[PDB]
């Protein structure tokens, strides 16, 4: 009723946020990185989209490696 769907949410939702975050890190090092926010690089976004398939291990390791939280 709740948990087997709920995990199935947190997976899919965490897919999305792990994709859109990763994309934002991949277009973070551009000259004017705002013209890729409004004009999405479909090749780059398609490369980044399936990175979030197995997102939980990437997020886990990035939490352990400290790459999940910026150090200001």
């Amino acid at each position: 009723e709740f948990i087997t769907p709920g995990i199935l949410f947190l997976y899919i939702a965490g897919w999305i946020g792990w994709v859109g975050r990763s994309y934002l890190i991949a277009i973070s090092g551009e000259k004017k990185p705002a013209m890729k926010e409004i004009i999405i690089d479909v090749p780059l976004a398609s490369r980044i989209i399936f990175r979030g398939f197995i997102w939980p291990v990437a997020a886990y390791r990035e939490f352990l490696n400290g790459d999940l939280i910026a150090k200001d």
Binding site: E1, T4, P5, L8, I38, I39, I40, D41, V42
Partner: protein
């Protein structure tokens, strides 16, 4: 086509394409598996 793929890369065109595909996906799923309130597949 050059500069049409840049327009289709723009946020609203890309958002309507993504959400049309996604909405069709959800719509066809609800046709296939209508009236769902549990996940019984385990």
């Amino acid at each position: 086509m050059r500069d049409l793929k840049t327009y289709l890369s723009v946020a609203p065109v890309l958002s309507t394409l993504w959400f049309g595909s996604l909405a069709g996906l959800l719509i066809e799923i609800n046709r296939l598996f209508p009236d769902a309130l549990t996940f019984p597949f385990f």
